[PDB]
Structure 1
Amino acid sequence: KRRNTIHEFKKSAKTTLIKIDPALKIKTKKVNTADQCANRCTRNKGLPFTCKAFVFDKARKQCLWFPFNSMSSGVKKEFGHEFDLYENKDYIRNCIIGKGRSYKGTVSITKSDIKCQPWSSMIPHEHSFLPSSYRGKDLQENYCRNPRGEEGGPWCFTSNPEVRYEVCDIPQCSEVECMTSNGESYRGLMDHTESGKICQRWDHQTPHRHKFLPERYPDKGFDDNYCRNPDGQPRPWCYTLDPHTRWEYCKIKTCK
């Protein structure tokens, strides 16, 4: 069956990750394209660990899959000409879309600034939200999550014995992103259209062929699948993953 999930990733060209923590493990395989790395990364039971990122080794044509990303305290980014780093946005996004069903970031305090209780802990609050019973929901550490996609967004059980749970205070991506005038200068991370369609990566020619090759417009900010306004529009836009919608404008508020 078909996939194509590379658009879920943030690329850092000519970049790899170096271990600080000596314990960290990786898995490798000979693979023809970064797209394949991505698909293997997002499909789990595909790897022995939850894959958060991978490097594509362009010289040796191999994927290096990681249970960590660049935000882990146990690693650091380093330059490497033959390597491209790809990090699944779910884990690094600093904001939520809607109810934040996809949120897998590291915010670990409630709206009232209470440190969250670890999901694997029954203390101080006993509960049935065990990581086991919720696969793909990344109920890891004490991170705010919305495993059942409920109104209110990501939440957590709190380390305070008197407050069983509370929602966390994680802004909508729509409130975090903003642009000036028509957004020609916009270099933000908005990556969905104003109707919620997922953007196509500029570095891809599928499903839509286009002239905006990042390498020939190095000044336009054609990174990943972020909405951009390279051609004098009212506002930024992107090609769409919907084969029936070549491109659509994005919704980005004016700064201030």
Structure 2
Amino acid sequence: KRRNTIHEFKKSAKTTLIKIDPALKIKTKKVNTADQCANRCTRNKGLPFTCKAFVFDKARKQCLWFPFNSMSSGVKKEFGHEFDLYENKDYIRNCIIGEGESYKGTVSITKSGIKCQPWSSMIPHEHSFLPSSYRGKDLQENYCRNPRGEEGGPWCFTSNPEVRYEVCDIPQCSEVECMTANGESYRGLMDHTESGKICQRWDHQTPHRHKFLPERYPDKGFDDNYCRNPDGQPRPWCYTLDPHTRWEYCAIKTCA
């Protein structure tokens, strides 16, 4: 099979999600691995809603797909060794990657400080940027989006009737992401190599085999697919999802 999208998720071990508010339905299915839950969560037309997070029950072997994450309203985290929560990074972001096409955070205020207009609303500014016309772009509520992958970055229509649209001020992910020395103590959230290749998850042996087992190295920060320096390398690094590139250095600026 070809689909491999589990890297796109932030894992919270021993955690499941419950929503107090019974609204927003959930789909559950008997599935063998967490990888299959992830591919279904990120697939186009895979679920009767936009999947933001999922939980893999390891004991019962089930996926639990949610249209919400742990940062939504009326949703609690709950304990259980058999559970593993996975939240799509796009909705946690807080920062931007390049044009910010993948950005799906909760910023709803323009660069000037004006509240964004709802995307599904024609007031004050009528338009054609509707969720129906741009599936997969998460044109929900009044959050800053970059649907057409334009140079300016994430933008929105403005609540002020005098300004139609404006860009939003969201910093590039390489903004606060800095390291001390050779990055031995770096525990940040960088997940792509210096050439822009996507990092392989540490808790995975595909497509590259390695000895850096998260269970074997607590305190080493082998979470998700973040760039790490666990072996005295000149710079932090990660294994790559490209079969023809085992590993590659990451580009994290020094805090000094």
Q: Which TM class, normalised by the smaller chain length?
A: over 0.9
Q: Which runs of 5+ in 1 are unaligned?
A: none
Q: Check the 8 A contact 1:52/1:66 in 2, yes or no.
A: yes
- Return the alpha-carbon distance in structure 2 between the equivalents of residues 76 and 52 of structure 1: 15
1:163 matches 2:163: yes
Alpha-carbon distance, 1:76 to partner: 2.0
- Return the alpha-carbon distance in structure 2 between the equivalents of residues 131 and 18 of structure 1: 27
Q: Over residues 190-225 of structure 1, what are the superposed CA-to-partner deviations in whole Å (9 max), with x where a residue is unaligned?
A: 000011000000001011000101111112100000
1:208 matches 2:208: yes
- Return the alpha-carbon distance in structure 2 between the equivalents of residues 204 and 154 of structure 1: 33
- Return the alpha-carbon distance in structure 2 between the equivalents of residues 194 and 128 of structure 1: 37
Q: Over residues 125-164 of structure 1, what are the superposed CA-to-partner deviations in whole Å (9 max), with x where a residue is unaligned?
A: 0111000000101100000000000001000001111111
3-state SS in 2 of match to 1:229: coil
Question: Which residue pairs with 1:5 in the alignment?
Answer: 5
Question: Which residue pairs with 2:177 in the alignment?
Answer: 177
- Return the alpha-carbon distance in structure 2 between the equivalents of residues 169 and 81 of structure 1: 40
Q: Greater CA deviation, 29-38 or 77-86?
A: 77-86
Q: Check the 8 A contact 1:117/1:123 in 2, yes or no.
A: yes
- Return the alpha-carbon distance in structure 1 between the equivalents of residues 92 and 232 of structure 2: 31
Q: Which runs of 5+ in 2 are unaligned?
A: none
- Identity level (%): 98
Q: Check the 8 A contact 1:237/1:247 in 2, yes or no.
A: yes
1:191 matches 2:191: yes
Question: Which residue pairs with 2:108 in the alignment?
Answer: 108
Q: Check the 8 A contact 1:189/1:227 in 2, yes or no.
A: yes
- Return the alpha-carbon distance in structure 1 between the equivalents of residues 29 and 14 of structure 2: 19
- Return the alpha-carbon distance in structure 2 between the equivalents of residues 238 and 85 of structure 1: 22
Question: Which residue pairs with 1:221 in the alignment?
Answer: 221
TM-score norm. by structure 1 comes to 0.98
Alpha-carbon distance, 1:172 to partner: 0.4
- Return the alpha-carbon distance in structure 1 between the equivalents of residues 76 and 141 of structure 2: 21
Alpha-carbon distance, 1:235 to partner: 1.4
Question: Which residue pairs with 2:97 in the alignment?
Answer: 97
Moved over 6 A (4+): none
Question: Which residue pairs with 2:145 in the alignment?
Answer: 145
Report which of the two has the higher share of helix: 1
- Return the alpha-carbon distance in structure 2 between the equivalents of residues 192 and 245 of structure 1: 13
Q: Over residues 76-131 of structure 1, what are the superposed CA-to-partner deviations in whole Å (9 max), with x where a residue is unaligned?
A: 22222110000010111111110001001111001011110000000000111000
Q: Over residues 32-78 of structure 1, what are the superposed CA-to-partner deviations in whole Å (9 max), with x where a residue is unaligned?
A: 00000000000031100000010000010000000001110121222
- Return the alpha-carbon distance in structure 2 between the equivalents of residues 161 and 23 of structure 1: 34
Equivalenced residues, count:
256
- Return the alpha-carbon distance in structure 1 between the equivalents of residues 87 and 67 of structure 2: 11
Alpha-carbon distance, 1:242 to partner: 0.7
Q: Check the 8 A contact 1:44/1:50 in 2, yes or no.
A: no
**What is the root-mean-square deviation of aligned Cα atoms in Å?**
0.9
- Return the alpha-carbon distance in structure 1 between the equivalents of residues 250 and 20 of structure 2: 39
Alpha-carbon distance, 1:181 to partner: 1.0
3-state SS in 2 of match to 1:248: strand
- Return the alpha-carbon distance in structure 1 between the equivalents of residues 113 and 20 of structure 2: 30
Alpha-carbon distance, 1:31 to partner: 0.2
Alpha-carbon distance, 1:178 to partner: 1.0
Q: Check the 8 A contact 1:91/1:104 in 2, yes or no.
A: yes
Alpha-carbon distance, 1:173 to partner: 0.4
Q: Check the 8 A contact 1:54/1:85 in 2, yes or no.
A: yes
- Return the alpha-carbon distance in structure 1 between the equivalents of residues 76 and 147 of structure 2: 30
3-state SS in 1 of match to 2:38: helix
Alpha-carbon distance, 1:20 to partner: 2.3
